[model samples]
Target: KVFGRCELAAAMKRHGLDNYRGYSLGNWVCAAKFESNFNTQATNRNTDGSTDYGILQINSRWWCNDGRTPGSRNLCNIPCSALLSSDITASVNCAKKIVSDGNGMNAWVAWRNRCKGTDVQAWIRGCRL
Candidate 1:
């Protein structure tokens, strides 16, 4: 499920994430770029023994169940695999809830580490929207 940056921007716009939940479209696109490089099949193991899933790299600890992780709270009530698909509805919904949880984009390590204060206008500069 690899996607170009423009494709992702269009998808985010279609999902209403261009400004959904008070987050800038640039923030979302930039975070996704660092999180998974626009690959839906992306997954990475964390030092805490948890795994991150999908373009947003959502964690299994609080959002989704990875089956291998015991006692998962499954806060988003979604399977971790769901985030690994081309369809981003579930992932987008979960991310919105995560942002609403009071952390803003800080919930994503990629956002904090790479996109926090960067000028991200180019992320969506030429997208058709």
Candidate 2:
């Protein structure tokens, strides 16, 4: 499902991304907006020949397996296609792993490029947490 801006915020908040690992919910919300435009089914092939999938655009090269590759890191231990679901349980759960991996929200270039060090609260300002 293509989530509205506030919808994504509330969703992430419910999943415990609010102030997770020292980053605010707005940080995650803003990164997802730029990464996948709040799309649960979004997928993109990167210049490195890897693919990213779902709302948070988790990359096949490291987070999820492609099942068509020489084997990815698959730290999430799920198929890359697993991320395409309208329900974001796996995505949010996996995203927390990424942050816990010491990458911070800096794992996504979109996050650093736009959301990092910015007024991320603006992204979820109107959303009821």
Candidate 3:
């Protein structure tokens, strides 16, 4: 797993995600909290048979291949296993692309359902960002 909330914030800022695609840092952090709790190794199987990967919980339906599933669009062009690593550069890059495609943070159901109307400042309460 990565360090925690503060470290995650620092990393995101370093990668220029403080206001990525017009979404606040809080939005990304809150989405990460609900989606994977900042754990890079996180993975989940969706009810529709798709899988979510990494800290952002990107969907296999559009991002990466799990190999067991056939004909994933694999838009991220990286294996799902790559997202399972502690290094999140690839996942963040893919997330950038996903956000740029106009979905914004709404692409993450966690963000839409859990973070949209909430006080996301709590996600970075002590991050010093």
Number of the top TM-score candidate: 1
Q: Mark the regions of model 1 whose C-alpha exceeds 4 Å error after superposition.
A: none
TM-scores for all candidates? Answer: 0.95, 0.95, 0.91
lDDT of each: 0.90, 0.89, 0.84
Over 4 Å off, model 3: none
Expressed as tens digits, the lDDT of each residue in 1-129 for candidate 1 is 998999998998888888877778989999999999999999999887889999999999899998887666699999999999899998998998898898788999779999988997779998888
lDDT of 3 at 16: 80
Candidates sorted by TM-score, best first: 1, 2, 3
- Report the lDDT tens digits of candidate 2 across residue range 1-129: 999999989888888989999998889999999999999999999877789999999998889988754556899999888799988889999999998987788888899999899999899887777
Question: Candidate 3: deviation at residue 29, Å?
Answer: 0.6
lDDT of 3 by residue, 50-113 (tens): 8888999988888888876666689989998888777778878888988988777888877999
- Report residue 44 deviation for candidate 2 (angstroms): 0.5
For model 2 the local lDDT of residue 3 reads 95
Clashing pairs in 1: none
User: What CA RMSD would you report for each candidate?
Assistant: 1.0, 1.1, 1.4
With candidate 2 superimposed using the best TM-score fit, by how many Å does residue 55's alpha carbon deviate from the native?
0.7
Q: How far is candidate 3 from the true structure (C-alpha RMSD, Å)?
A: 1.4
